[PDB]
């Protein structure tokens, strides 16, 4: 279930990074076809995952970036 995952991730993030100054995380692929319910659930999953963290940056690349 998606909530199980978001909640477990929140547990880990708080266990290891509750006092960190900044957390960077992958931004999951957004939903398709602009279903109004699928949007509210996308946002909710991310809010649960990052509950009580003060500074978070989500990043999603094109996958084509070559850093080296």
């Amino acid at each position: 279930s998606k909530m199980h995952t978001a909640v477990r991730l929140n547990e880990l993030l708080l266990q290891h990074s509750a006092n960190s100054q900044l957390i960077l995380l992958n931004l999951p692929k957004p939903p398709v076809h602009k279903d109004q319910q699928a949007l509210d659930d996308y946002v909710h999953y991310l809010e649960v995952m990052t509950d009580k963290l003060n500074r978070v940056i989500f990043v999603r690349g094109t996958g084509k970036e070559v850093i080296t």
Partner: protein, 231 residues
Amino acid sequence: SNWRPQLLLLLSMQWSKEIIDVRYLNLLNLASQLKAGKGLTVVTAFLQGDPTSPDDKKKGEQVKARMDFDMNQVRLRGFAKTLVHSEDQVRGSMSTLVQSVGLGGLKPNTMLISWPVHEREETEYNTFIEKVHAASINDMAIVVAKGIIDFPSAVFRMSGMIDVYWIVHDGGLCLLMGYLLKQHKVWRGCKLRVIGIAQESDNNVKMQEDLQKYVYQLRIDAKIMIVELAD
């Protein structure tokens, strides 16, 4: 390659001559810390109004003049532009801007936006996912700052940890962003830490070794730590 973020900021908040919005200033500060005085960042603000009206064009120039001033204050080199759009045309206006930005010049490769300000009520969010889709279909990375009201300005010197969480596929992009932030004086006193989240199949030892070598390939100084997902 040596890919570095060439930023496009999209601002969609209300503008007033009586207040300055701190979330907006803090997003400029975050951009400036990523760029360390380099590059050319494009900052665009979307202003609801009549796009054929002289009064609204005058308003858009005032907002552009404020953005130029604020970008200079935070030492963010680049350009500001204010787009006027009708209320019912915000979607096409935002999408067309991401399509049309960089014509005949360097094109941005990274969009920087803030997490939506208000709680879900049953718009602000409907704009948000539109921006996410616009970045990816225009071959841009996207960077979303959540908690931007609490992000530091140039007067602060942060110390403690910057944590990057790494999962099964991803890429080195999160890690690069942390590294660039640590180059700025605001974050220079922070330690960079990469936390790998292990699946039930991966063994923790070999995931630590892989990330250690990868970080070394990137020439980034970071401590590696492996955490197990399941419980």
